[PDB]
Amino acid sequence: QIDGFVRTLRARPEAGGKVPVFVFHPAGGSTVVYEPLLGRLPADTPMYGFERVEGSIEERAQQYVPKLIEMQGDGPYVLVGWSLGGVLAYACAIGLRRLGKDVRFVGLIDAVRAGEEIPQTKEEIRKRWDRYAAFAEKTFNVTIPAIPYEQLEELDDEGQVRFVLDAVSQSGVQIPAGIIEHQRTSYLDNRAIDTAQIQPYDGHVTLYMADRYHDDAIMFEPRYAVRQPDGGWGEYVSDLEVVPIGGEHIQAIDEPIIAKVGEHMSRALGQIEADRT
Numbered sequence: 001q002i003d004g005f006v007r008t009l010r011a012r013p014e015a016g017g018k019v020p021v022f023v024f025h026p027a028g029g030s031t032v033v034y035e036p037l038l039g040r041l042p043a044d045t046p047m048y049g050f051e052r053v054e055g056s057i058e059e060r061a062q063q064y065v066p067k068l069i070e071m072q073g074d075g076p077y078v079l080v081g082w083s084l085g086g087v088l089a090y091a092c093a094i095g096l097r098r099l100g101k102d103v104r105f106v107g108l109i110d111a112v113r114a115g116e117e118i119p120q121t122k123e124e125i126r127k128r129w130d131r132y133a134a135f136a137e138k139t140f141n142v143t144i145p146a147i148p149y150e151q152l153e154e155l156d157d158e159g160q161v162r163f164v165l166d167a168v169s170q171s172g173v174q175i176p177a178g179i180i181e182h183q184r185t186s187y188l189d190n191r192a193i194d195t196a197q198i199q200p201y202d203g204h205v206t207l208y209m210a211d212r213y214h215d216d217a218i219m220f221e222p223r224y225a226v227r228q229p230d231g232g233w234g235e236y237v238s239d240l241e242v243v244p245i246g247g248e249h250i251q252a253i254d255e256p257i258i259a260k261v262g263e264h265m266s267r268a269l270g271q272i273e274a275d276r277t
């Protein structure tokens with residue numbers, strides 16, 4: 001069921017059949033999280049999951065788009081994701097369109113921009129790490145000494161989190177490799193969003209919109225405390241539909257909330273299959 005970065009959640013028939021749904025992984029999870037959604041979609045809808053790759057959002061989409069084409073040719077493309085996965089689906093839709101492929105549905109499952117832009121500055125790096133330090137002092141009941149701001153600010157997001165994790169592991173017990181790896185890659189995958197270069201898109205985007213980010217998101221980046229009516233997509237997408245779903249971001253992928261998403265998506269897929277026949 002895993003072939004490189006492609007997971008088969010439901011294999012398509014050998015010939016013809018329904019348009020597959022391509023889903024994209026969240027930060028810190030795999031595409032197994034789309035199983036509840038799969039169960040709310042029509043029977044026999046194929047679903048393939050794209051798992052983690054390295055690079056900027058644009059570079060990741062450059063790895064995905066050739067594989068999408070190998071599996072599905074000229075289209076129709078249905079592209080869906082929650083959280084980071086929505087940003088990935090969108091970057092793949094832009095990429096496919098540039099190659100003239102037929103993208104008919106882009107489903108963003110609470111892929112909502114921070115309500116203020118995240119500055120890419122030294123001052124923001126300082127502020128971020130001071131925040132994080134303060135959370136570490138309270139949670140672990142320690143004092144953190146002066147932060148080495150020069151060292152952090154010459155690093156990208158991966159380098160900063162690596163340097164901090166490596167400092168922690170110079171002292172005391174050896175932390176299992178799986179735990180360090182998961183923390184490092186979840187952090188950098190979430191930070192890859194901040195510098196996404198969002199390009200306008202000329203087709204229909206559907207944004208399933210929760211009420212708010214959960215608290216851990218807001219601790220990670222306080223600008224997720226506020227959200228705009230268009231989730232930050234309006235200037236880029238003229239043909240934007242918002243489907244309110246309630247709850248918190250973290251709950252959007254799970255039952256019961258995923259049932260509203262699935263009910264809606266099923267109607268959209270129904271329309272797509274009708275337009276083919």
Ligand SMILES: COc1ccc(-c2noc(C(=O)N[C@@H](C#N)Cc3ccc(C(=O)N4CCC4)cc3)n2)cc1OC
Nearest residue numbers: 083084087111112113190193194198216217220232233
């Ligand atoms: C058009 O402009 C944009 C539109 C949409 C977006 C966007 N779409 O999706 C997201 C998103 O979901 N960001 C996640 C992150 N980062 C949220 C999150 C954070 C933290 C956690 C968590 O639980 N943590 C931390 C450690 C345990 C979970 C989710 N942003 C971005 C845009 O431009 C930059």
